[PDB]
């Protein structure tokens, strides 16, 4: 049997995906057929060759209790293949792998640290939920070992079990209890992010926790202050991917808490001002440091400081620093909300950005940025934004428009111009699930409805296609007729509004292809209700119900027979159940 | 009716562009590949795409991707036809046409851009002729370019004078898997192969149903022809009339004819297959192969595919005669038997394993098709009965003939 | 939580999957073949991160090979691209000249890197010389 | 490195210039822009070499938009080589004449252009009947300042039909690109003498001289058999497009035939071998002619109803081609093949081509529907398929058992006794509507159809809009059947879609049932369990308004799009 | 071609 | 070379047997819920053999193990009078498969401590073992907490392997 890498080699060669696809099969045969002669050993090798057409996307399914025999092997390099693909091929729903809980569990139980590894491995990245069931009292035994080389991964297995089995964490309570003082970082890590893991699933372990803030303050204190490592240092700054940690830590922890708060508002102060941002790296530090502020009860000068930290960072032409201040303001909407307003220029400035993130951000925190002060004047920009959307946005858009609009609108009918506008220049794009609340709003309003129909009118006649423009049009018809064609039984001086028309452009919905037949199912309703709505041309609209009750849908040929008995049968009481429905929240 | 007609790769990279409008923008071609990646993945997949106004007409060799591409309501098989015959004539330049043919040699294949096809509309398609004055290695263009005959230059002489004829079967077969025949029509083929002085004119006479319905010798052994196409050589106003095969051949290898038929008569070769597919265990094929055909014939080199599943394993194969080749890269089996006459019947008995966990998805069920070759046998029963040589100088030439019987499309639906 | 990495090339060519989330076949080979394409259709100023569908998809082009990460929405970012830079640091560590066709080829050690790296989505080692010591220490295990 | 190359370009030796102007061209070739060297190897243009002059009129071509201005430095050139002896080098700047497309050009070349127009050759008056289109392609209105339509007409009136059918091919383009100001047909003399002339000319010239037929139309029927019995022997062509633009015109020429003679029905037995043999071509030609086929028995039923078997898929066959082939069974689905298509359909249902198979649930359900001798038989195919248990396959199979129901409602109760028993867990709001339909409309039969919407009554407010609407509309029809088991069924629905709704027409149709059933459930008896009238089935046959245009349009893009010639060009 | 020809005739008057 | 499978109910001394045969010692074990593999190599010959653990989220996948498979043991325990049903269930849901039709059975009667421990003759007739077709089943009462008659069935079980 060839070897991994004469395979890939081949495999290199290949022009064709069809014509590599008959490499692989080539192959996964020799492969099929060795497992068939349970073969020990290159059972190293096919399974790695295995494992390489499962990266390059083939039906490796096959060969999964080979892992399982390389995972039971007594080779350490067997075991170092047999990890690797039991966190490949299977996974939870696999529903093999549940083969590996005594092999790993004989394995956490290894001499060698490096196959414990292995285990903690395999186990840490793709646990079962019963798997992690079946081995938390080996993990946290594990965890009481003193073999950091362990003791960096039990902690990060245990995070992953509590991660799977929300309700074992009780058990890790006591598995925590004063290991913070690891002179090693990477296990003293990983024991941040289980303690962020703690701390994040229940308050109740809050209280344990807030006790040691200052244990860590100090130790953070401690990153700061030795300015250097010769491991852990990048561009001069010293283990940062643990000082961002313990922020989280304190940014979860003290977020509600002042004492604690203030035990971390030291290391903030200093930290704020300590901090190298030059490189990348520290500007990392500074960006959770914003965030960490933000979300604790903390000091005021901090938070002054923060939004100065944060126009530097709106400033800064690296569009990842604006990705990050644009988050930033994002995160801190509610909280210090006026320091935010006056970026709001900045804000428009990256509505006009090249990148789809800096405009998404830019899109959305102008939807967080709408108070009833800037109602009038950022929508004149929006809605022109929303003119200047790309087509992805502008289903974005036109629903956060309609998201602020509910919030903070100073009147009811500009609240009513801006919808209808945008219902015109949206169309396609704007969502069929804020139909039914554009509908709720505007019988939320219960004062202009001739204002609204007519205008509702004006547009349908210029086109249909737009369907949820015509989904809003059709129930505004069937209910406020009697406000769109008033006091009109009969002919009268030409008014826009004709009755006839009116009875027309419904029923241009109803053979038009472009009718999303809810449409048509709105529409079948609006003819019914102007029987009661309309007193003008009444069974002329019967014609149109009776002649649809042949038609192809399944309901809406229901919809016209179960009308047009009332039309043929119950004429007085065709109104008897038209009266308009109730308003509802 | 193209405007600019494009040979990609399978990368989507230009190997020739020629445009014969203007009236597609060049650059175009480069959503063409997206559009393919689009419509493929989707399934929406056909020989037509469209980005905009842009009509995007492909045919798809080897590597390549000969896009012609039109704005208007074109001619839509006119565009089509010219594209196999632009691959035929680099086919007959070029003897593989691939990326190597096209970057080698764009000093000839330009100058066959410009003179296959002007405007959209091709004028000179018949490579033969066409070598006279194209050539890779200029004078003016032959008459018979000019001329309405346009696939035979004069002045053609050879020492010998031989007319090589190839009446090739192509047998056609649906058997579902109910074991019924559902079409098993024959397509069969006589492609000439003429090595003739000057310019003759050959009449030919087959064992025609409705000629010998003419004739009056409608009860003895006549072949009927449901439909043919011809070549164009062919003066079918003549043979409209009265069956009259009459035609001024081309020089050297060509397809004269292309009879098709049906045939209510058994298959030349019936198969029976079984599938005992064991659920995470195996599978077995006892599968015979008789043949119904006459014994003095003989099927050449038989490949029987039988289409096996993909994680089948172990195989086993308890044959009577003939050997089987396992092909797993296209997860089926080749009981290939060399020589098998009429009237034998060969049985294979297969044996695989098969996983003892199941796979992710379904697999579909391919036919069976073998790759039989039955020399000196018309099924049909087809028979080429004179060949008139007429020669303004006159010769006597040496018409030659064999029968090759092999199968068309031979699928017989599985279990 | 580093939802799961992936490794492709100038043409997409994947040279590393590791799903730190369980989601079927189907679903990786669908999610996989968009994210090449999202970022094989995306420019070089446009701020190494995607906010995909409540994952902030971080990516770092190095080489011809390209980078992809799927972090939690409440994560650091730029971190998050050092996490990537520190692994390209080990990558570059381990190998020296760290380069591409030994990612096809020796592939398997890189995920072996990667699990001395990151196993669960996170960090459980921040040195950047204790994690190649181990690996080289159970590479000298053999 | 290009000035280099403008160094060898400007050399004297032909050695030099002559790998020069390759490396452009191959520069050209791998797609440099290398329209800066534009006016330099013009410089190199007017050599001996007459394979030297093919690359410069390559480049020329290519860059004449590119640089219009530096485009006059070829005109004399252009003129001078109009007039060397050989015919090769003459046709060779005609083709490069009309294809270069600058307005500060085409003025100038139209007397070189009438010098080729009464040249001798056939060859490169073949070729400068083309340019004269090229010509109205640049400038329309300059080719009838030139007068060189009725030149074009005479090449028409020449021999050696080459020339004439490329006469006759710029002639329906130019005619096309005239708005039919002086339209361009000529008598049956001509038509005479192009049908003469269709024996002779090549495959190409085979086809264009048809397409001039495509907007003629015979007067009389022997006019009109005449010139169609000489269009007959072309259907024994290799060339399918000679064919297809045979059968174009034979199907535009019927509509003038009696059908009182025999000829129609001689013409109709002599189209259909054509047409079977048109599928017996390459899938990409055969592609074409589905589209072409649709459009035919949608016309023409008749011709094709006695051929099923060549409609079968093949295995190895193209998906466009699997799809299509499944329609035109449906176009001949008729009594005298219900079991061949069925068994067909259901062998076409045991596939991996979902989109395949989901189209053949599709053509089940049209068999169905067209023919209601094997309605029962279609219906007990499917069921095999439900029985299958492959969800696509079954949640294809309920909408389309639901719309037999809806076509034939009446005798099929005993179908919904199995399915009752359907794996309700089915997710497809399009056939999870089509059981509650199902499940509704007859919900008399469904003895327990009460306890099993209470599944469908769980995460009701959060389903569809469809699936939603169908539980308000089959518990209203299963209360108005059932008013005993399902009272507190039929009020907890309206506390549902008239106070926990949004969804208005929910609220709509909600509060409708409601004031319904409060009212008048007696006389709801008569308003929604109303015998509801015979569904009118959606015809499929384009319209012969439509369809006849069509006609005149087959081969062309308006087949392949079953859609009017503008509905799709731009 | 391994196969070999056979000769037909001419005329057959 | 055998493979050799240890199926049965959990808690069946499966495992105590398997480090009896292997290392000759009765270790601490866990239940097991993956499963356990020991090439016990006696009589000249090396028994591969697949211990698996016989809980109840376990007894599905058994059918992954049962290609290429020479011979069964089905641990069965002679304290369970209650579970001897469903191990009889076991039996006839597992012997009546097409893979795994051609490996021997050697059946365990484990655990002969207490006088509810049956002899085999019983086990045998409760488990209906005469019922059985095409079937080289041996009952061997074992006793694995000592070793007893578990060598013995191996002894058997090699004269089994060749033919
Ligand atoms: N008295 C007595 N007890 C036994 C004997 N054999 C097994 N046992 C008991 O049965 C229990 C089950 O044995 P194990 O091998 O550890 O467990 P198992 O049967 O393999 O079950 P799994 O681990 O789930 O596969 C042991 O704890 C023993 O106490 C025996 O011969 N005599
Ligand atoms: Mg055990």
Redesign the pocket.
């Known amino acids: 049997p060839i070897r991994l890498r004469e395979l890939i080699r081949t495999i290199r060669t290949a022009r064709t995906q069809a014509e590599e696809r008959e490499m692989i099969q080539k192959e996964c045969a020799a492969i099929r057929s060795s497992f068939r002669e349970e073969d020990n050993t290159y059972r190293c090798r096919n399974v790695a060759k295995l494992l390489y057409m499962h990266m390059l996307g083939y039906p490796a399914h096959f060969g999964q209790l080979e892992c399982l025999k390389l995972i039971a092997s007594q080779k350490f390099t067997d075991k170092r293949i047999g990890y690797l693909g039991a966190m490949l091929l299977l996974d939870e729903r696999q529903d093999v792998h549940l083969l590996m809980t005594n092999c790993i569990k004989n394995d956490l139980n290894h001499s060698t640290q490096f196959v414990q590894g292995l285990a903690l491995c395999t186990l840490g990245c793709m646990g079962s939920s019963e798997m992690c069931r079946d081995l938390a009292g080996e993990v946290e035994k594990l965890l009481k070992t003193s073999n950091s080389y362990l003791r960096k991964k039990a902690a990060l297995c245990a995070v992953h079990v509590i991660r799977k089995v929300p309700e074992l964490m009780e058990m890790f309570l006591p598995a925590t209890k004063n290991l913070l003082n690891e002179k090693n970082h990477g296990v003293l890590h990983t024991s941040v992010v289980l303690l962020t893991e703690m701390c994040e699933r229940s308050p109740d372990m809050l209280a344990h926790f807030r006790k040691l803030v200052p244990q860590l303050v100090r130790i953070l204190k401690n990153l700061i202050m030795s300015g250097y490592s010769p491991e852990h240092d990048v561009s001069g700054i010293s283990d940062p991917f643990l000082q961002v940690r313990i922020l989280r830590l304190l940014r979860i922890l003290g977020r509600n808490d002042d004492d604690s708060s203030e035990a971390m508002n030291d290391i903030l102060a200093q930290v704020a001002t300590n901090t190298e941002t030059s490189k990348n790296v520290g500007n990392a530090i500074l960006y959770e440091t914003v965030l960490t502020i933000m979300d604790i009860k903390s000091e005021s000068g901090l938070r002054v400081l923060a939004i100065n930290i944060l126009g530097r960072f709106l400033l800064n032409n690296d569009k990842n620093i604006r990705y990050v201040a644009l988050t930033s303001l994002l995160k801190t909407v509610q909280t210090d909300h006026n320091a935010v307003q006056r970026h709001r220029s900045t804000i428009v400035d990256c509505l006009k950005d090249l990148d789809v993130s800096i405009k998404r951000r830019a899109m959305e925190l102008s939807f967080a940025l709408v108070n009833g002060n800037n109602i009038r004047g950022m929508m004149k920009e929006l809605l022109y934004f929303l003119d200047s959307c790309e087509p992805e946005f502008k289903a974005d858009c036109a629903s956060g428009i309609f998201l602020a609009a509910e919030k903070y609108a100073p009147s009811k009918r500009w609240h009513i111009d801006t919808i209808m506008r945008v219902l015109t220049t949206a169309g396609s794009y704007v969502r069929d699930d804020a139909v039914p609340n554009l509908i709720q709003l505007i019988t939320n309003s219960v004062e202009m409805h001739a204002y609204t129909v007519q205008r509702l009118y004006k547009a349908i006649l210029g086109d249909y296609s737009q369907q949820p423009l015509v989904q809003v049009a059709a129930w505004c018809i069937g209910e406020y007729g009697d406000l769109l064609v008033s006091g009109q039984c009969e002919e009268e001086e030409p008014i826009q509004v004709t009755e006839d028309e009116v009875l027309d452009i419904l029923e241009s919905v109803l053979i038009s292809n472009m009718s999303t037949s809810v449409t048509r199912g709105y529409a079948l309703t609006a003819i019914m209700k102007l029987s009661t709505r309309f007193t003008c041309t009444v069974n002329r609209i019967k014609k149109v119900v009776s002649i649809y009750g042949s038609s192809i849908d399944v309901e809406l040929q229901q919809r016209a027979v179960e009308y047009n008995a009332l039309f043929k049968k119950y004429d007085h009481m065709r109104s008897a159940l038209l009266e308009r429905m109730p308003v509802m929240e | 009716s193209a405007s600019a007609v494009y040979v990609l790769d399978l990368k989507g990279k230009v190997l020739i562009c020629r445009n014969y409008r203007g009236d597609v923008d060049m650059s175009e071609v480069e959503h063409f590949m997206p559009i393919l990646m689009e419509k493929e993945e989707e399934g929406m997949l056909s020989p037509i795409l469209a980005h905009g106004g842009v009509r995007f007409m492909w045919i798809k060799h080897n590597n390549l991707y000969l896009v012609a591409t039109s704005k208007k309501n074109a001619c839509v098989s006119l565009v089509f036809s010219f594209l196999y015959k632009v691959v035929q004539v680099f086919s007959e330049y070029f003897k593989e046409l691939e990326e190597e043919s096209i970057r080698d040699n764009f000093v000839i294949i330009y100058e066959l851009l410009d003179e296959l096809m002007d405007f959209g509309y091709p004028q000179t398609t018949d490579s033969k002729i066409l070598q006279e004055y194209i050539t890779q290695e200029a004078p003016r263009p032959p008459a018979t370019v000019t001329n309405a005959v346009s696939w035979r230059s004069e002045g053609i002489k050879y020492r010998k004078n031989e007319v090589f004829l190839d009446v090739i079967e192509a047998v056609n077969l649906l058997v579902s898997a109910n074991g019924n025949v559902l079409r098993s029509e024959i397509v069969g083929s006589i492609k000439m192969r003429v090595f003739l002085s000057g310019m003759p004119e050959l009449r030919l006479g087959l064992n025609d149903k409705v000629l010998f319905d003419n004739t009056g010798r409608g009860k003895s052994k006549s072949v009927e022809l449901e439909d043919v196409k011809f070549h164009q050589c062919v003066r079918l106003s003549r043979f409209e009339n009265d069956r009259t095969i009459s035609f001024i051949p081309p020089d050297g290898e060509f397809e004269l004819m292309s009879y098709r038929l049906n045939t209510h008569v058994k298959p030349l070769i019936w198969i029976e297959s079984v599938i005992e597919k064991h659920s995470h265990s195996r599978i077995e094929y006892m599968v015979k192969a008789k043949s119904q055909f006459k014994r003095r014939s003989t099927a050449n080199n038989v490949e029987i595919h039988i289409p096996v599943p993909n994680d089948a394993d172990s195989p086993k194969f308890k044959t009577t005669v003939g050997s089987v080749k396992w092909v797993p890269e296209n997860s089926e089996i080749v009981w290939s038997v060399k020589s098998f006459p009429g009237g034998k019947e060969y049985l294979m008995r297969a044996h695989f394993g098969l996983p003892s966990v199941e796979a992710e998805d379904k697999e579909g069920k391919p036919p069976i098709s073998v790759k039989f070759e039955i020399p000196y046998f018309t099924t049909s029963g087809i028979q080429v009965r004179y060949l008139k040589i007429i020669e303004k100088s006159g010769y006597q030439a040496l018409p030659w003939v064999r029968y090759i019987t092999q199968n068309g499309d031979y699928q017989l639906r599985t279990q | 939580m580093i939802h799961f990495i992936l490794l492709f090339s100038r043409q997409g060519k994947l040279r590393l999957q590791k799903w730190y989330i369980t989601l079927p076949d189907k679903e990786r080979k669908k999610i996989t073949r968009e994210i090449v394409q999202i970022i094989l259709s995306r420019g070089h100023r446009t701020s190494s991160f995607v906010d995909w569908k409540e994952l902030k998809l971080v990516y770092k082009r190095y080489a011809s090979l390209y980078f992809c990460c799927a972090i939690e929405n409440q994560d650091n970012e730029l971190l998050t691209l050092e996490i990537v830079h520190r692994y390209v640091e080990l990558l570059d560590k381990y190998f020296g000249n760290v380069c591409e066709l030994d990612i096809i080829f020796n592939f398997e050690k890189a995920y072996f890197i990667l699990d001395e790296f990151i196993i669960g989505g996170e960090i459980q080692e921040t040195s950047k010389k204790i994690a190649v010591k181990a690996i080289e220490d159970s590479d000298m295990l053999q | 490195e290009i000035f280099e190359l403008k160094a060898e370009l400007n050399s004297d030796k032909k050695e030099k210039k002559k790998e020069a102007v390759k490396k452009v061209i191959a520069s050209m070739t791998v797609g440099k822009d290398v329209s800066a060297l534009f006016p330099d190897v013009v410089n190199c243009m007017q050599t001996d070499n007459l394979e030297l002059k093919k690359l410069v009129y390559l480049y020329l071509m290519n860059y004449a938009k590119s640089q219009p201005d530096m485009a006059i430095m070829a005109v004399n050139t252009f003129v001078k080589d109009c007039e060397d002896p050989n015919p090769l080098i003459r046709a060779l700047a005609v083709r490069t004449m009309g294809c270069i497309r600058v307005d500060k050009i085409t003025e100038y070349l139209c007397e070189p252009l009438r010098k080729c127009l009464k040249d001798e050759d056939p060859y490169v008056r073949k070729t400068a009947a083309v340019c004269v289109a090229k010509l109205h392609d640049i400038n329309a209105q300059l080719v009838e300042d030139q007068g060189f339509l009725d030149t074009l007409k005479d090449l028409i009136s020449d021999s050696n039909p080459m020339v004439v059918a490329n006469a006759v091919a710029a002639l329906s383009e130019i005619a096309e690109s005239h708005p039919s100001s002086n339209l361009l047909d000529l008598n049956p003399q001509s038509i005479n003498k192009l049908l003469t002339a269709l024996n002779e000319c090549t495959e190409w010239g085979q086809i264009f001289i048809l397409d001039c037929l495509a907007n003629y139309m015979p007067k009389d029927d022997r006019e009109a058999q005449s010139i169609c019995e000489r269009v007959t022997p072309r259907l024994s062509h290799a060339n399918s497009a000679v064919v297809l633009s045979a059968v174009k015109v034979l199907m535009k020429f019927m509509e003038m035939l009696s059908k009182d003679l025999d000829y129609y029905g001689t013409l109709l037995k002599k189209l259909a071998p054509p047409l079977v043999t048109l599928l017996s071509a390459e899938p990409e030609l055969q592609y074409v002619a589905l589209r072409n086929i649709n459009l035919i028995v949608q016309k023409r039923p008749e011709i094709l109803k006695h051929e099923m078997k060549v409609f079968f898929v093949k295995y190895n066959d193209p998906i466009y081609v699997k799809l299509e082939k499944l329609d035109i069974m449906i176009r001949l689905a008729s009594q005298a093949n219900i079991a061949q298509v069925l068994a067909e359909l259901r062998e076409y249902a045991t596939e991996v081509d979902v989109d395949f198979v989901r189209k053949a649930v599709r053509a089940i359900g049209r068999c169905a529907i067209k023919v209601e001798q094997s309605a029962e038989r279609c219906v007990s195919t499917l069921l095999d398929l439900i029985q299958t248990k492959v969800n696509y396959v079954v949640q294809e199979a309920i909408v389309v058992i639901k719309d037999i129901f809806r076509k034939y409602p009446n005798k099929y109760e005993s179908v919904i006794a199995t399915l009752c028993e359907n794996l309700d867990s089915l997710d497809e709001p399009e056939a999870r509507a089509a059981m509650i339909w199902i499940v509704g409309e007859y919900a008399e039969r469904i003895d327990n159809a009460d306890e099993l919407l209470e599944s469908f009554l769980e995460g009701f407010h959060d389903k569809s809009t469809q699936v939603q609407l169908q539980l308000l509309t089959a518990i209203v029809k299963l209360f108005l059947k059932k008013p005993t088991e399902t009272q507190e069924l039929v009020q907890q629905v309206l506390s549902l879609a008239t106070q926990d709704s949004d969804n208005p027409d929910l609220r709509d149709r909600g509060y409708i049932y409601w004031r319904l059933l409060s009212t008048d459930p007696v006389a709801a008896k008569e308003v929604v369990l109303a015998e509801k009238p015979l569904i009118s089935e959606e015809t499929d046959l384009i319209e012969p308004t439509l369809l006849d245009e069509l006609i005149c349009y087959i081969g062309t893009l308006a087949s392949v799009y079953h859609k009017p010639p503008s509905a799709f060009v731009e | 071609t391994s196969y070999d020809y056979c000769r037909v005739p001419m005329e057959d008057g | 070379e055998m493979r050799i499978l240890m199926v049965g109910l ?8 398997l480090y009896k045969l292997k290392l000759g010692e009765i270790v601490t ?4 819920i993956g499963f356990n593999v020991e090439t016990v190599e006696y009589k000249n010959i090396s028994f591969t053999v697949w211990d698996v ?3 109840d989220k376990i007894r599905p996948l058994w059918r992954h193990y049962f290609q290429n498979t020479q011979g069964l043991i089905f641990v069965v325990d002679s304290n369970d009078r209650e579970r001897v049903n469903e191990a009889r269930e076991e039996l006839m849901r597992m012997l009546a498969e097409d893979e795994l039709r051609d490996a021997v059975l050697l059946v365990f009667a ?4 207490l006088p509810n421990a049956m002899n085999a003759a019983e086990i045998t007739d409760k488990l209906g073992l005469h019922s059985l077709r095409h079937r080289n089943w041996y009952i061997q009462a074992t ?4 070793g007893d008659g578990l060598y013995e069935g191996l002894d058997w079980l090699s004269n089994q392997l060749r033919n």
């Open positions: 959990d808690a069946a001394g499966k495992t105590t047997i074990t866990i239940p097991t653990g016989g809980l484990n655990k002969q401590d006793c694995a907490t000592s």
